[PDB]
Design a protein around this ligand. Structure first.
Ligand code: HEM
Ligand code: HEM
Ligand code: HEM
Ligand code: HEM
Lengths: 142, 146, 142, 146
């Protein structure tokens, strides 16, 4: 797939609004995933997954920054997430199915926090954006 | 579905605040906008040319009320979904030819809509409860496919 | 999803051996698919899906031929399959999930007919190749 | 699972000809080769660097035999897969931390291997019966996840 210019405009607008809450939204998305899709917990046996744990808060922040980086370099994601792409492919080795679950929980979080901005068109653009990030992150798996 | 008493009450409690016709129209419109391939069943509905046209189409809105009203009635039978949706499952397979993946898409779009509608009241545990319900309904509807 | 030179070599070699039987294997893959994953039948309400149906055999040949064309243009798949991407995206509108099911059935078909050639390395290359074809075919969905 | 008498006999008939040791080794080896991320559970197994390395690895062949032998056991209890696998379900979740999606990939690779091994005898109807079995097994193993 590919993002149209209109998609990039919607993402930039919505993400811009997240602004300084990116890390807090990042943490909430993870908590929503662990609760809704418990099988994702299999990748975090080394974490205190208790609500508000610093590990989750910290991880939520690293996830948010990476999304910020991709929004910023929306026209050259492969290059922007290169490092993350290697990490997931060669070390973490998270089954590709899990990316769709996190993407869903990130969309739900954004929805819950952006009443004005979460229109059908933006919703569509964000979904596509999350799918693209997911594709870039799993692109070096095999 | 296996929902604890707590989960059942959380589902029931939010649902009581829902305008079924409204959320129905919204959820169905958003499905057709976010996953355009789903428009394949709706060529008789008219103009689905833009998000605005989809969201504003009276046929989409009408089909949304119909779909969500059925969903809504199902909420009363959390313990017997397969039973409750058996005839509809057969209909969807034999006459309508609807790939059950569409039920899963709609369930995810429905959760996003509730999230957008309820904001902060749609907590992680209330989401989890709704996820089990939407998966349960999708499963119940796909049950009689052959 | 990048096809290395060895992947390309593997694919051309295996498809090479299919040769004349491509259409027969295409029909067999469809048959396997309809029996194993009944939901896929929802897209062919207009077909006689019985064993030996000429419609399935006819469709099987069209699929197999498209695959042959993909192997031939393995370096330029998007352009080679352009009309097929348009078709699936805008008219047929087959849910993307289904592509994985046909791909699996094609692999099972190849396995059952190419004992010698279906090594673990070739199996991996073919799986990557069918995932690339699927990606191309769904690239214009949204 | 729900198997017709003909599906049950097809499953049973083919399985009597399977050398579990040999097929188990092949199935697990092909899993690690085709979906290399699955190697993350087998860091202590040695060299999994090449297909040849993976396929002749004795720890792979050994483990493969264990897995299919346990799989063979559920074939005997097709009517109670969850009950048969409950203990191993809890083990894989709680101690092993294996994402259940891996059970699904193994199921698919196993089908490929039976087709490779049996050729023409692995007909469309036989495959279909096996696809229901492997899905049942994967489901039985993910059952106690929490
Ligand atoms: C939108 C998709 C994702 C993004 C942007 C993302 C990003 C990141 C980042 C930035 C890191 C930290 C890198 C470092 O510290 O060097 C990381 C690590 C990690 N991610 Fe991903 N990730 C995503 C999806 C997933 C999914 C779906 C899972 C599993 C369900 C996952 C599991 C992990 C784990 C286990 C770690 C290491 C945790 C630790 O030990 O700190 N990731 N990811
Ligand atoms: C919660 C999930 C769903 C429920 C409860 C549901 C329920 C219903 C009901 C109650 C009807 C009317 C049946 C009748 O005419 O007696 C119907 C018809 C129909 N539904 Fe479903 N539905 C669901 C999901 C879907 C989805 C996702 C699609 C397609 C993307 C779909 C496509 C259709 C179509 C095409 C019809 C026929 C409409 C007509 O003839 O006017 N349904 N559905
Ligand atoms: C590797 C994947 C696939 C390839 C290469 C492929 C290729 C093709 C080709 C060559 C045609 C004929 C176009 C024409 O009529 O000119 C076609 C049509 C069609 N395909 Fe796909 N296809 C693939 C996957 C799928 C899947 C997974 C489904 C659904 C389960 C599907 C459903 C259809 C349908 C319904 C038609 C129209 C058939 C008719 O009415 O004659 N395709 N495809
Ligand atoms: C058909 C599905 C499967 C069955 C029936 C099965 C069964 C078993 C059994 C019987 C054991 C031995 C327990 C013991 O004696 O300690 C085991 C261990 C194990 N399994 Fe599973 N297994 C299945 C699938 C998988 C998959 C797909 C993976 C990951 C790719 C996996 C990863 C493991 C690991 C890492 C161990 C521990 C090996 C060790 O002791 O180091 N299993 N499994």
């Amino acid at each position: 797939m590919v993002l149209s210019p209109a998609d990039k405009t919607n993402v930039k607008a919505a993400w811009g609004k997240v602004g300084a809450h990116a890390g807090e939204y990042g943490a909430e998305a993870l908590e929503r995933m662990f609760l809704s899709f418990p099988t994702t917990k299999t990748y975090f046996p080394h974490f205190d997954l208790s609500h508000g744990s610093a590990q989750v808060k910290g991880h939520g922040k690293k996830v948010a920054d990476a999304l910020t980086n991709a929004v910023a370099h929306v026209d050259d994601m492969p290059n922007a997430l290169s490092a993350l792409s290697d990490l997931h492919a060669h070390k973490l080795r998270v089954d590709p199915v899990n990316f769709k679950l996190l993407s869903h929980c990130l969309l739900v979080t954004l929805a819950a926090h952006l009443p004005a901005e979460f229109t059908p068109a933006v919703h569509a653009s964000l979904d596509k954006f999350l799918a693209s990030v997911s594709t870039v992150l799993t692109s070096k798996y095999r | 579905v296996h929902l604890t008493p707590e989960e059942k009450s959380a589902v029931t409690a939010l649902w009581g605040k829902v305008n079924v016709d409204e959320v129905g129209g919204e959820a169905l419109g958003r499905l057709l906008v976010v996953y355009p391939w789903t428009q394949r069943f709706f060529e008789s509905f008219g103009d689905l040319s833009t998000p605005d046209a989809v969201m504003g189409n009276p046929k989409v809105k009408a089909h949304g009320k119909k779909v969500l009203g059925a969903f809504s009635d199902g909420l009363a039978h959390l313990d017997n979904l397969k039973g409750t949706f058996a005839t509809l499952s057969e209909l969807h397979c034999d006459k309508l030819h609807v790939d059950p993946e569409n039920f899963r898409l709609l369930g995810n779009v429905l959760v996003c809509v509730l999230a957008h509608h309820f904001g902060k009241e749609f907590t992680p545990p209330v989401q989890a409860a709704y996820q089990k319900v939407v998966a349960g309904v999708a499963n119940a509807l796909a049950h009689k496919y052959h």
